[PDB]
Symmetry: C3
Subunit: 148 residues, 3 copies
């Protein structure tokens, strides 16, 4: 890997490897609940605590992809720094969402979706460069200097 | 990012950002159903409108990854154009499948599949370049002019 | 795409295209069970053959992303070979896990967490170069 390049991605790699690890966690607190009983054949309906976790997890597992998307698209098609930071916050919301979705009655994060703002934003850096590029492509070329 | 490069990917990016947005939709029509279904927390069951939506959605969520795969592999490993268009249709099938799945509840709609032809194709462009590359690696270098004795 | 570059990824592409196809299969053995036992909504603990499959499947579909991640991170950020191989074994565990999580009456494999060691490893190649790069930058 060309040391230069690796430089301008290291952040998204980091953040990604972070989320990669937080992910295995969510997937671990799902083992706890499938174990505390007859999950011995992995019954996908252990109850209250296990149904509350497999739920919270299988809600973050649907977010991962569509997040990673704008995490990079807004990482290459536009500044690898803000893209990687906003992507880091997303790992914070994911924590505080997969957390509150623990249980104990009440409205345990009655949401499937969460950090709408983050991905919305990331998607805006993506849509940013994606456009700004079309400019560098047209009125970026032309600029004819017929200095003959 | 290198202006030239960004150029030969802008389409996959576009199609991708499209699908990213259509995705957020699927996950929005799932919030409507978990909301009217006056729930406290949020279970995977409780209605046929919400159980029909969370289903349609969580069928497209299984497909996103395995599609994104061949969308790019067939986008870099061969033509960024067809790859990007084919991937565009896929977002049309996804629309028409995620739509028929609940509204009609008419036997003809059910199914965890949608667009096997597209991904299959995209996968053929990826398997295309992947091989053709092995040639350029092996035979592309050849040129028996060295027998100019 | 630059023939040189395509060279240093063809492995991860290969393994990936493989897992892409193994994936479509898992998604096929899920069609068989939704067909033999009808349904429009697969969200209530149903047929033990189709509930056993949609489970096994929707257990590998949560793994795909978090695996593909370290598959490449550990493929670019460090050796395209080991990364590609390790990722290959993961496709074998996947087969052996999504297989035992079927059977019949037999103790259908529990725990949807699998190949912990592979991803762990791949994650270490990624965390490898990720750091080693910081040295080449500093030293
Ligand atoms: C990089 C790591 C995390 C150190 S290696 C690793 C590990 C790391 C180890 C060492 C065992 C650990 O932390 O305990 N655990 C377990 C784990 C990970 C993070 C935390 Cl907080 C706590 C426990 C894992 C578990 C699964 C796993 O497999 C991948 C996987 C497969 C299916 C999934 C389905 C849904 C969601 C995530 C999924 N993840 C790889 C690893
Ligand atoms: C342009 C954007 C990127 C869609 S901004 C955005 C938006 C845009 C708007 C409508 C203004 C909003 O924030 O209210 N909604 C809402 C939305 C999205 C698409 C459509 Cl049709 C209609 C409304 C969102 C919702 C979620 C969301 O991300 C989180 C998320 C988490 C888990 C998911 C699991 C499966 C599928 C998608 C998932 N999405 C980003 C956005
Ligand atoms: C590109 C392919 C994979 C070669 S053609 C194909 C195939 C191959 C077959 C069915 C024989 C074919 O298309 O003619 N199956 C099923 C399959 C897979 C392995 C084997 Cl052995 C035999 C049959 C598929 C399934 C889905 C599919 O579409 C993509 C898709 C969409 C939703 C998914 C949801 C969860 C998991 C994976 C998903 N994959 C394309 C194909």
């Amino acid at each position: 890997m060309d040391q230069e390049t690796v430089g301008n991605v290291v952040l998204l790699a980091i953040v990604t490897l972070i989320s990669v690890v937080q992910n295995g966690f969510f997937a671990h607190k799902v083992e706890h609940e499938s174990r505390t009983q007859n999950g011995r054949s992995f019954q996908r309906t252990g109850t209250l605590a296990f149904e509350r976790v497999y739920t919270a997890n299988q809600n973050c597992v649907d977010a991962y992809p569509t997040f990673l998307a704008v995490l990079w698209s807004a990482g290459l098609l536009c500044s690898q720094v803000p893209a990687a930071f906003a992507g880091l916050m997303y790992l914070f919301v994911r924590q505080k969402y997969f957390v509150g979705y623990l249980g104990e009655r009440t409205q345990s994060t009655p949401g499937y979706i969460f950090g709408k703002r983050i991905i919305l934003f990331l998607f805006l850096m993506s849509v940013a460069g994606i456009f700004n590029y079309y400019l560098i492509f047209f009125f970026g070329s032309d600029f004819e200097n017929y200095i003959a």
